[PDB]
């Protein structure tokens, strides 16, 4: 979630260019995002983001079912840009934008905002209202060419903050050893439990949880770390990176 980067990246982007959502969900999946090539002082003007997939495949949830996926993202923006004031925005951008709360990374971090998680099938197409800086009024901003940095998310992460595998992601075989049981991990709950029996004679247990199909069977012979699941995950994260010039007004 984007609260995840909030809570443990004071930059979500890192000195290569990689935004840190993509520490967690591990598959790469492209999006856009656009905005006017220029714009004027103290101006309401609009970023239109895109986050597509397709709507008909469904995930694994937490609670082990399958589900619709929900999107989020992080836009970094100039120092300067911030998030459109309601009173700034017009009603027909408002209704644009729809049901959404844009929020700060931070309370110190206005030009940096985020969204999520909300629905996929709604918002795979969001439009933020943004209100451009003035110079004549900030010095730290000047009339020139301005980076925006974009990152889009629809689907379950991989990985928690602690480190620990989600249920959406592929389980591996802890050792080398032939298969010799597999077993429901519990009385519906789904998950199952590999027991492979090593070279030496001891047998280990794998734990799955509900999510991932298994992709092995029994008396099959499997090597350290080979997948025995699936890789559920039907999401994905992307970057899209694009400019735009504040224009001085001049007369
Ligand atoms: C690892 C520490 C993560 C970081 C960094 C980010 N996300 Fe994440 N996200 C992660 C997990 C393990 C999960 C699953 C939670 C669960 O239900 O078990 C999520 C989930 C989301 C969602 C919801 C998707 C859905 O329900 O279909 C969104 C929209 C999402 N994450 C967005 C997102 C963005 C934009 C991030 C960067 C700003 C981000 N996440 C970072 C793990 C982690």
Redesign the pocket.
């Known amino acids: ?2 609260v ?3 809570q ?2 004071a930059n ?1 982007r890192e000195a290569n260019g990689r ?3 993509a ?3 591990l598959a790469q999946k492209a999006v856009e995002i656009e905005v006017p090539q220029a714009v004027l002082p103290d101006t309401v003007f609009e970023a239109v983001i895109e986050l597509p997939y397709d709507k008909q495949v469904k ?1 694994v ?2 609670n082990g079912k399958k589900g ?7 836009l970094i923006l100039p120092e300067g840009f911030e998030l459109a004031p309601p009173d700034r925005v017009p009603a027909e951008i408002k209704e644009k934008v729809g049901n959404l709360y844009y929020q700060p990374y931070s309370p110190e971090q206005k030009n940096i905002l ?1 969204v ?3 629905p ?1 099938k709604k918002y795979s197409e969001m439009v933020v209202p943004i209100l451009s800086p003035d110079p004549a009024k900030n010095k730290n901003v000047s009339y020139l060419k301005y980076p925006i940095y974009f ?11 602690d480190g620990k595998k ?3 992601t592929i389980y591996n075989a802890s050792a080398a050893g032939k298969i010799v049981a597999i077993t429901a991990l519990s009385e519906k709950k789904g998950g199952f439990e590999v027991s492979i029996e090593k070279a030496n004679g001891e047998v280990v247990v794998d734990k799955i949880p509900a999510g991932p199909d298994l992709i092995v069977k029994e008396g099959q012979t499997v090597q350290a770390d080979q997948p025995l699941t699936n890789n559920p995950n039907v ?1 994905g ?1 992307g970057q899209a990176e694009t400019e735009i010039v504040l224009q001085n007004p001049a007369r």
């Open positions: 979630y984007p995840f980067a909030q443990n990246y979500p935004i840190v959502c520490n967690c969900h995930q949830l937490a619709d996926l929900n999107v989020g993202m992080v985020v999520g998680p909300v996929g990152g889009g998310n629809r689907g379950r992460g991989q990985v928690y903050p989600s249920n959406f999401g994260f």
